[PDB]
Amino acid sequence: VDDWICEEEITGTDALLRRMLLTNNAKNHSPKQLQEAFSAVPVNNTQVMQIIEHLTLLSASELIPYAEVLTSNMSQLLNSGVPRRILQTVNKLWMVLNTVMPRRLWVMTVNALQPSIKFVRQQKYTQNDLMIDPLIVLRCDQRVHRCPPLMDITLHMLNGYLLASKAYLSAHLKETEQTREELKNALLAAQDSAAVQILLEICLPTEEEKADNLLCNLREVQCLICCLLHQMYIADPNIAKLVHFQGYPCELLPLTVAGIPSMHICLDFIPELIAQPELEKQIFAIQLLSHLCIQYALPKSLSVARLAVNVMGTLLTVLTQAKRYAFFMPTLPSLVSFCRAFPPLYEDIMSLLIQIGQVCASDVATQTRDIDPIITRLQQIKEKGSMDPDVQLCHCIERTVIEIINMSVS
Amino acid sequence: LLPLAFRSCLARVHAGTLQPPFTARFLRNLALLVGWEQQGGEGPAALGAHFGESASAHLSDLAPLLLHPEEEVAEAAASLLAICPFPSEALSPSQLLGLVRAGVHRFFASLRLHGPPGVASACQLLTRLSQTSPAGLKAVLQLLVEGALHRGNTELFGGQVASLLDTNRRHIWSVFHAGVIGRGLKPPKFVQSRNQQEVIYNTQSLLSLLVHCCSAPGGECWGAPILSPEAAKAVAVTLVESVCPDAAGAELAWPPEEHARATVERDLRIGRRFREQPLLFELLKLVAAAPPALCYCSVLLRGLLAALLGHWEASRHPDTTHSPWHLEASCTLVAVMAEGSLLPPALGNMHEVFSQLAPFEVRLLLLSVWGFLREHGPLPQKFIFQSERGRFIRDFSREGGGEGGPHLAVLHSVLHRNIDRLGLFSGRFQA
Amino acid sequence: NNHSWLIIQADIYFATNQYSAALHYYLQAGAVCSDFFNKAVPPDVYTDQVIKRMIKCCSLLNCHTQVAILCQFLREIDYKTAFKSLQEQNSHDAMDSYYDYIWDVTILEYLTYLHHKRGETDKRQIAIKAIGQTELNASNPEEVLQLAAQRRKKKFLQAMAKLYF
Amino acid sequence: VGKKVVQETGIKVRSRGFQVALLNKDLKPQTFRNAYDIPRRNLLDHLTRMRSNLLKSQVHSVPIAQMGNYQ
Amino acid sequence: SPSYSPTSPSYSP
Amino acid sequence: PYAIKAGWKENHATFMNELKNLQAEGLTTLGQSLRTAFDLLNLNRLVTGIDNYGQGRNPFFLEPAIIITITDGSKLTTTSGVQDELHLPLNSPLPGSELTKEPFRWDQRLFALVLRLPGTMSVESEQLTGVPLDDSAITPMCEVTGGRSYSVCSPRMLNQCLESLVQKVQSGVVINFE
Amino acid sequence: VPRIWQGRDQRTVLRVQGPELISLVELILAEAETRSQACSLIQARLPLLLSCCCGDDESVRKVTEHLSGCIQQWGDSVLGRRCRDLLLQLYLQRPELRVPVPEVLLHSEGAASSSVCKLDGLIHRFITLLADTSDSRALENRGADASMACRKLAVAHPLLLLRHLPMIAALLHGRTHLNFQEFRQQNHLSCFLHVLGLLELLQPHVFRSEHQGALWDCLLSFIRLLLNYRKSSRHLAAFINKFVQFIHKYITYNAPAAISFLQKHADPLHDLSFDNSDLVMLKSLLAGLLTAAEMAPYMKRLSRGQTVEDLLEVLSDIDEMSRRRPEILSFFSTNLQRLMSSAEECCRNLAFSLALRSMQNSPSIAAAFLPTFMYCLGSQDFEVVQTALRNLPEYALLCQEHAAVLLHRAFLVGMYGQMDPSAQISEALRILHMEAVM
């Protein structure tokens, strides 16, 4: 629907500017001239700027000749120090070309956005090639991951090829008939979930970005991917359920919960996600529920939080020492979020925290340790270590209680 | 005035008020006052303050400050604890345990931080705590060695110890490989590095503290002190508890070699513990300095000897130096057994020749050691207390066959076979 | 360091339902009588009455596995209280960590059954590993079992001392 | 004498009837048939395998008794 | 109902 | 419901498969299991009328069976506690059970193979003597029903006991003499 | 930028360094200065400052002290005026800072501005809880806790409460008509004495011009109550004493406003004086139109007492008369702090109750009891720790700046010592959260 609603008249000012500026007979700007402007030894951003700015005025029908030069040279736009307006206008022109010339534009655009270290890199990514394996479009040069216009382009491509692949393999299984439908549905669900996971991993800050600065290209790409995932979840919430059952790196949970308004449906299946055997899935469920409770503080959210507290208290006395550490290290920062969402949980949260603190203290007492936290019973506050698991878990319990008390007190 | 003042100041210290600079200043000033009063001039007598008693009243309150995150407060409290007198009556078991645990933690923490120089205060505190009572002595020794052998602080003494996106990048249209075996590639493996000089002098500091805690007080103007067999026995038994589980075959009498073949797993565990932690041998010879105590390490010595016997049997090299650690461990083990009077001087000198022999010869000598210990045994009752100097002495002449007839025959045969290289060492095994 | 007065203080705390303080002072008396807990505690101090008092102290603090340990101290092991306490699930002490200190094979048998019935397979594996220890084989020579029990007793009492002092 | 059933996977979770099941013993996860049985650890590889299998283009886990019965 | 937030007005028919 | 896993109408392969996959995870509920075993053996007696009740006892109408109970020496346990004395429960009697007023029947015997293998090896020259009787709770129940218990303390003693057991299987009935 | 916020739904965040923030706030002040030749633009620009500070307590405190220095520099210039306006707006937006801010803003009239405080709704919640009560003793306990929190906020942040003065004035207006019998049974006298004490504890600021109208409304409600139930004036002896002391302070600090109120309501006062002539203090007012020495032997006996009998006797003598004269307990603070750590149960409990009552009357001295209370929590004597836990919610409600470390100590002793303080910490934390951020 994005391409169709793009065609919709907004105000008609574009027609006015068409009739006014294009009448200058500056239409001497030709694809060969644009290609020459791109291939200057210096960057020479002025000439390409003027040409593509002029091309914005061109109607979609006559803009077809410029498809080859714009797509072929968009790899050069990844270089450092390219002006933003160049990429913005390229995005606008690509959207226009997509509105009138979708399929071959997609084929040539994917062929153009190859990593380029492999040079040709199998330029035979035909229409069928992408239609069978939509994830090819994600196999692109790393620089697009922090280039918001071309990233938006790639997201459009990815959505289109997911739907195209669905219809394609449906048609293929129909014609090859001469059960398999279950395998079709499973393959489609797996493909959509895999696309979602790759996008989420793109949203992660890399090590260099890890090496504050909340306004950058990464935030723009995160917003774009969040919008696309919102569209996908609206299209099929079962994909959201499958992705969350698969889980993903918990650093994204604030980002994903804040940027995907359809995420509120997660409270429906979180009770069933909790009941999975895998410890990792339960940990992820607790973290997800904590972020949602921060976001949406609803009675159903409170009931699911009560269930979360009860299961954490339950399997506190089912897990071994190593399992206790591995489970309660990530899910303890969720308790402060639960306290923030729901004051009526203070009783159960504090009772659970006391029980786990005494269990961990006894566990510390069983074996000789380095720090011996029990004798350090009168320590002060310490805001922000390869020690043994139990003292780490005790310090984590301490920090959880510190955060809860500090936020409630102020 | 002084009890109330100390109470109020410590209460302010424990509460959020009285920030760490003033806390360290207060502790240093109180330490200065206690040390000044101990220096019995005219002024301390005239003042009549009794800083020592009032400070002693709040020992349970001062003990947590040894664990303070601020280093200056920690060392100020360490000095104050080092000099402050304990209560006239005694220390309560909770107070004694808290003081010992805080003292050993401060000892190891300051050893890690400042090295050996910044250790004197904790050492003085622990020596005093050991001197308070035998229970205090046992607690200090046990906790100190346990913290020394703990996975943390063992490095002080030379001890040992994007997915989906990248996957899509790598991925022509077939999986080729059927799957990944286990959890993918193994990690980049563990590495370690520390100056050996620092290891040596940290071990020296720990061993000096242990010798201070073990040696009896007082006295006379001449004569080196005697290591207490009770303290060394405590160190021995806690070493046995730490290294191995003390599970089976724990009686001091050694069993036949059939049992050595029947308990190879425990022996290998003991051997690996000795290989990873060089500090264990130092503690072994510390135990061996006192004669009766090394008998209680009979399980440790038996297991290590069994591991070495297995290694020498399995060894295929012609020279014994291709196995550096095992050769050194055999030499050290025999020397330690000789120090504790578990072997006669003739057997005790065999480690001098281990570096020259083939593996089967050194295995035969160690098996002769095993046979001798089967015949006589490391029984503490065999040690006769020589009241002439307050020390236990093992008499092998009275024991009968103390020279070890068959064992010396085996040793002489081994020497005679390799007489070309071992001619000069023939005198070390004379009667 | 007068163990009789420490036991009197512990009983005074126990009479007022101050179970934590009572257990603290019982452990202090035990620490007085033995050289810390290196030696075995004399029978006339840790009598069956004192050990039962410690049992009830641990039970009222929801340290149920600790009750399971102390049940072995008695002249005859009180399997009824130990089994009734291990059935609890609101434990405040690290249940799996204390399975090293059981030396009686029937206590561990009940433990393995309980974990199997409730489905916690991993703790059942820990219990089965504990049973499978060679030193705990019930048909060992008597002094071997006695020494294993003694060392586990020492380690457990030292852990309790570190926890409560 | 047959009793072809296994132990209940429940937990009897307490509010101190929702329960968390144990490991699905003998489940035989139909990874190709169901997309929820694919771990994130190996999502892409199984995706490729099921894609290739679906086009025109559990085994080798036989019991030990039936492993070398050549007859 | 993923297209409507839980704190949005409900269209009662 | 799960105690019996190889009853009647079960082939040898099923027996072997069940025997391999045994997990030691229950209580030492010796009495209830022994009652289950005796009820299983006496399941078919009344329907075929082998026990001629009220018509004398026929030694030629016998279905010879022996129960070889292999167990350790540890005391009996139940969820309530340790029982420390073997008691057969009679909570749900099989129909017609009161006619014999004893679970074990005329042609049945119970041989206990009490495993007492020590953890650490203890070589003893006393092992060369004959297999001794065990002191556990199962020994009186073995004695009353014509059988006897065995206390093996080494693999060779286990082999000797199993050799003795094979010689002790023979079709016959047990009579108390006076 | 719309790209940064694309996909958001605009419902319920950047970091900058110190000197950059100082430059930004000085730039805001320059904009205000050139705008001067109201506070509209300062409030318009303030969201940027809050976003840039990112809720960083240290950054906000740095800006606060920098603006205080600027106000000290300029004094009362146009730049000084706009610095005061910005500082008061920031204080309203970030009132969680324990500092009540210096006297410079206590003289300004920006409290009536069209501005929203980050804490106003919460004190509104607590003042509703204070006023609304019934015969229930549970609701009376709730109202007492509400009075405690509101009083601590009064002594800590007096300006915030005075912005809500017309509200409680209207409530006082509403509650005055009800006859004496239902007034006493419904415990409305508790509400009246609570608001009267609160007004007393908002002493030097309630007499300003902006607060004058609601103050006159509250006083009108009080005098209407006095006139309507003049028959049973004897049961209102404490209320009459408190009201006359408040009138004394009113005529002392602000004589013109007090006189202007008195002439506005002269005839009710004259009629009440003629009818209730036994109000000798009222007649003394018409005419206008020691304590430490008594407690010497008590303090000496308490200090020098050793046996439990003597301590119990002196504590009971202090307790029995302190109900009549609550002000006296301020003298025995340091002396009975040492009794709170006493091993004996009875004297310790009685000392804890007396200390709690003392700091209840005077919330300022509550912070002085922090070291002894923390020592009691951490002491070896388990009875002492138990009773410290028992009184933990009350003292936590009293302090509220060291409630963080206090509850942390309580949790730590619960974690290692086997006691279960989950209930006490839960109640204390519930009240503190229901005050500070809810």
Numbering used by the authors:
A (entry chain b): 724 to 901, 922 to 954, 984 to 1156, 1177 to 1202
B (entry chain e): 549 to 709, 726 to 735, 745 to 791, 796 to 1008
C (entry chain h): 831 to 995
D (entry chain f): 474 to 489, 526 to 566, 578 to 591
E (entry chain Y): 1619 to 1631
F (entry chain f): 59 to 236
G (entry chain a): 1704 to 1715, 1724 to 1748, 1754 to 2005, 2042 to 2190
Manuscript excerpt for this entry:
The Integrator complex can terminate RNA polymerase II (Pol II) in the promoter-proximal region of genes. Here we present three cryo-EM structures of the complete Integrator: one bound to the PEC in the pre-termination state; one bound to Pol II in the post-termination state; and one of the complete, free complex in an inactive state. In brief, we mixed four purified subcomplexes; namely, a tetrameric subcomplex containing INTS10, INTS13, INTS14 and INTS15, hereafter called the tail module, the eight-subunit Integrator core, the cleavage module and PP2A.
